[PDB]
């Protein structure tokens, strides 16, 4: 999908879909647009129909914005978005806007247009993608609309190579395959990028190591690094994704109804992976260091065993109660990792917990850390983007729901507090530095006739970079 | 349990039980007090002996505070408690501290007697009481002292009450015998009361209706009335407290494990009772109305019907989806006899979802409103006694969750946010008053060897009248 | 509340209102917007409409592709074009590129989907939404086949829509005495008789069907519905049978709570039977008619029907109740021994009965079962006829051995396997004198999800089969 400006108003003779966002006023020099607004109902903010011409049936559309908000944007976005990827060319008109509005309005219909035409057809036997190719936005604020298409192209980028590392099976996304794509695609973005392998792992990371020995395939430790700052030896934020490519349980098996959507437990490592490449390609002025810990969560003769204690990078030990737990233990290490690059801030993203669904739900991700400043800047993105988040507190005494008789912590805690419990495992290992941690187990993937990664947090994630 | 005050220094020759609450420096004119402190350990904050004198085996002890926060103080004060439930007579000094330090220390070591000493032996066929009868706190700052025993004899006047309540078994604690409970305990503090019955229930709040007449118990809304400001027509802050004195599930019945928990769910009603006879008992200069709806959810050959659609007090219609989320029934049509009121402030109160417990534990109340300031002001209050609280958010799209072909609202959501999602119903019957929510499902009552009502939030909700 | 006529002229391109051109392989010849929607549909789009600039407004256009001819692919589309239809006050429908035959085959099936797209159920809504569609008007030059196809049309979603709002209404609305005296109401409007039978006689006669009502504080009925439209009024007639649980908790043998809502659907095979009745009686068929409704509520009390208890039938077998959710057994028996003081023809009841037939077919077949091959073929028959789409499965004997009791003549339920089967087999015993089959509804009766609400059917099915009688 590639987006493009025009200074002049959308002519009615213009060949293509034509797609007139306005705000009260009907569009004065288009007929059918004209009758297009001036019959919409009370709730109706979308209305489209097909006229006859001499080359063949013109696609026109009318989208009404009465409210200002993103969300509100977003929502009429998405709508004429799904009638946007049936069209091969949609020239979208803005003049109906101020410089700022326009390029608000701008970079949302290009997010929503561009999310709307993926698909992933890649295992099928033909293809059937989406006939949207080419949106033309009219303005006469071709600065900052221009401007906003480069985020949107970013944003889009991004949350693309999310969903397709998230929307893979668990058999071709292996962790070597996440690992050789994370590689390749900040390669080809001019990033830096190193495989730490499984010999550094079980020697290191004994916490990692033992989620991934019960499982054939090796784990890898991915690390992407760009230095996109003015200043390049200034400290640099890391981004810590987990990337269970996919989680049976191990001995602590899960159930068998709808363990497919298991193969979204590296939609963290595939957030983490993505807003980098993001952030590449928008040439941000800061330093990034991306790092991913990507294994499989198998059961086997060698599997871990409830009970079991290791020792995490850290040094302290864990006694793993239950195997199905398995996200905390590779990611402490790649946080115990993170410490070395003396990083200005730390955000994990990590399919963690069900019980963050059971807290929030399906459209808002969580939050916890133990730097309310940097808690308080990615709520301040939340909320641009409409990429929704609320903060749950991490209090001392949910530490009280965390001891062992037999190691130094236990990796689960006494019943109650889910999300935040396992949120106060991770703190014990980020207690060096600014952290905070994004619970997408809810937000990272939807169910039903839907079913496929959505690419959240992405917006968080990238805006929080934008903003730095 | 009474408290007294007295100015002089702590003898070493005092008759009764001796506790010094020291700071950094140890007792200096008592002996076995100067042994204690000086043989701490590095985490030991209390120590008690026994010395041997001619009138018997006298009690020292001592208590070491490092830090001032409340936390670190109702935490020292809870370790010397149970200390003194076991001493007839307990002789505190507190001179190691300025003023306002005094009063503070005096405060938490009151309520932690108080509380401790509590006993529910009311079934049993030998009381088994606590020795514990009286408490002398020495220093020098008598009037600040003074008033802060009178908030402690408050709070844990209300606890009690509030224990009380929760305590009794549900065939004891029937709806009749909470309202005629409620009403006895307003009226003996000068307070006033009236009981709505049966007839206008099934006449105006069929919601609240259609949960109770599947028991035998008739239902009773009682209003309890206190005007304690200059102006007695300035606009009240009213509670409204659930009071499902047992909840079976109804049709949609409960697992039989740990049933017998569920005679707290009416732990709102005798947090809102409780917390309005404090704020009378300390004179507050407020206008207060508790609004308190309580019945039984039974399974019978007349209960509530999955898919039954009721008709609320409010005019919209609500269909029963689980007769198990009963408590939203009676609280929302209690929440639309509150705005008569004309309210300055609404709080409910309610044992509402096990979701809750999920989301924050059994440690942290939750709280969800439709105005920012009632919720900040509440939080506050939560800091203030350290009777921890957080806030969820009542975002717009929870409504999403709730949709019905056949009602205005069904009484519960599509899975997710199980907690915010009741609040969000709830909401659709506040939208009139500044509101606020408490969750307090997890805080209300605690299990296993120390099974019992806890009294909370009381500390929190006394501490929002008194900085009203 | 929605209305059929028909034209015998070409829709001409000036017509107000909706515009809908029925077509076959080419596209429609005076109409421009019709025609340049016809010319861009592609590989499998078969419904594609606009809106037209007019000097009266934004007018509606739309056509349709009907390649195949069978009933299931004109549902189909007609289904397709019914969601746009919703949104128009007025439809004109063009069909003439069809023979007689298939006229009157695609104006059936269209009005049939105009008027069930336009069914709402807002009863107990603060503001009702109803659909703007009125009048759908369609334009052929077959006009005595057209014209008999929308009278059929108009009757089964006439009966459609009654058994729709029995089934949606909520339990505490739609009691055994709300479904009794509306079932009274809507065959006497129709000039047919009605009498409701109440608890003193059923708790004397009917102890099966007693056992089951005993435990809600609801008064049970049967409601017998009688049309004689036959030139022998006293000739034999057919006989429907249908099961009202108005709500099933499942007594002492309790359901779980998850989607026990849906139990609110427990009485649409009483809702198929009554409005499959009225349906008949507003065709004037010429046929004999008698439709049996055992209605009560299936709730736990101090008073509930236990496992284990033993009850007598009317039949006078005694039935050893095992497991009290299975009850709609204990109420249909005792109806389908009320059922032969009429001599019938044939009796087919109704029921959504067990679980098992959705494991079994899924949620868009029901199954039938009976004793009589000629009474299933003309059930299956019927229900290729509409595309009301049903199954037989055997009641052979061995199924029977799966029924055995040490301490009644037969037991409620069988040992595990055959789950549907077995329930017809129990019900066997209680239909040998005359020609039975039964219909098991309990997937196709309503749907879940977003779309929750009831279907209407087997609805279909059952008028055609009373149409071919
Ligand atoms: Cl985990
Ligand atoms: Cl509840
Ligand atoms: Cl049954
Ligand atoms: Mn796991
Ligand atoms: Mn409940
Ligand atoms: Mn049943």
Known sequence: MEFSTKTEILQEQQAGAQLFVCADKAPEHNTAAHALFSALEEGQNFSDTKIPTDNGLQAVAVVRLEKTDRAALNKAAAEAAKWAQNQETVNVDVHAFDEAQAAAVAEAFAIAFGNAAYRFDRYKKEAKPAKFSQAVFHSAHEAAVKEALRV??????????????????????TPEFLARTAKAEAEKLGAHAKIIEKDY??????????????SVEDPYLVELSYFGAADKEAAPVVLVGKGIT??????????????????????????????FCAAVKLQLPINLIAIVATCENMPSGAANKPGDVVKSMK????????????????????????????????????????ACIVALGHDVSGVMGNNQDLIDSLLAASYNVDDKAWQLPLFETYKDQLKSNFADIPNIGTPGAGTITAATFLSYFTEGYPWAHLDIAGTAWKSGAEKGATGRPVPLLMNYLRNL
């Open 315 to 354: 040094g302290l030990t864990i006694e793993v109660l239950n195997t199905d737990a398995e996200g905390r233990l590779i990611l402490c290490d790649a946080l115990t990792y993170a410490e070395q690059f003396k990083p200005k801030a730390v955000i994990d993203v990590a399919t963690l917990t069900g």
């Open 246 to 275: 996919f989680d049976t349980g191990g001995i602590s098996l899960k159930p068998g109804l709808n363990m497919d959507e298991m193969k979204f437990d590296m939609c963290g490592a595939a957030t983490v992976i993505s807003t």
């Open 152 to 173: 949107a192209e970013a944003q889009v980028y991004g949350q693309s190579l999310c969903r397709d590392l998230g929307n893979a099976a668990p058999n071709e996304c």
């Open 201 to 214: 792992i079980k020697e290191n990371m004994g916490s990692f190591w033992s989620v991934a020995k019960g």
